[PDB]
Each structure stands twice: as C-alpha cells, then as structure tokens.
Amino acid sequence: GVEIETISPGDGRTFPKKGQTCVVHYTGMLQNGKKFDSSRDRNKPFKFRIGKQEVIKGFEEGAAQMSLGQRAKLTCTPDVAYGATGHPGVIPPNATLIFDVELLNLE
C-alpha cells in the first residue's frame, strides 16, 4: 500500500518510466518519530532509475504515481521495506514510514 497525498503544483504528465534516471528531493520521517534520511540535508538529490528495485517498494511505487513538479507524501507500509527485518540503528521493525517526496526529475 502506497498512500499518496500530492500537494497540487506540478505538471501531471511527466511520469517515470522504465530505466529513467529520476531525481527526488526526498525527506524521510517516522510515524510518531523524527527524520532518518534526507537528500535535502545532503543536498544530493538522489538520482535513481526506475526498474532495478534499488529503492524500497514503498518509495518505488510512489515515484511512478507522481509527475514532474508534484509534491506527494508517502505513507509506506512496514511489510514492503523493513517490517520484520528492521535496519540496525535507523529503521526499527514494523515501522510505518513517512516521506516528503517531490519529483523534480530527469530523463
């Protein structure tokens, strides 16, 4: 499950396709928790491609459902990224992840 709450401005048509290296100013967040990962803090806006399962399924499905300029807001389920596993020190198991995703992409 990927719950999208798009803040309106964008274009609504430049969708990420397969093998398109796309750029996201992401900003991570835990439900009832703080940030854990931010491309805005690094100022390195995470040039990633679609179709290789580089990113988690909660972040991959939210990218193709957005367009250029759009500012959505992910609500990632635990079972798609780290629900039983959990990352050591960053993501606990059974965490419902929150992301500030703005698709200002390339290709």
Author numbering: 1 to 107
Cite, word for word, the article reporting this structure:
RyRs are calcium-activated calcium channels critical to excitation/contraction coupling in heart and skeletal muscle. Ca2+, ATP, and caffeine are well-characterized activators of RyR, synergistically activating the channel by inducing a rotation of its activation core and pore opening. Broadly speaking, conformational changes along CC1 involve the cytoplasmic shell, the activation core, and the pore; those along CC2 involve only the cytoplasmic shell.
In qualitative agreement with the experimentally estimated association probabilities, the binding interactions become favorable from state 3 (“S3”) onward, becoming most probable at the FINISH conformation. In the absence of an associating Ca2+, the energy of a transition from S1 → S6 increases, corroborating the experimentally determined trend in Fig. 1a. At the hotspot, the trajectory crosses over to the +ligand landscape with ~0.24% of the probability of association with a ligand, terminating in the region of lowest energy on the +ligand landscape (“FINISH”). The distance change between Calpha of opposite protomers shows a pore dilation of ~4 Å along the least-action path, which is about 2 Å less than the dilation observed between the classes chosen from the clustering analysis and to the previous reports.
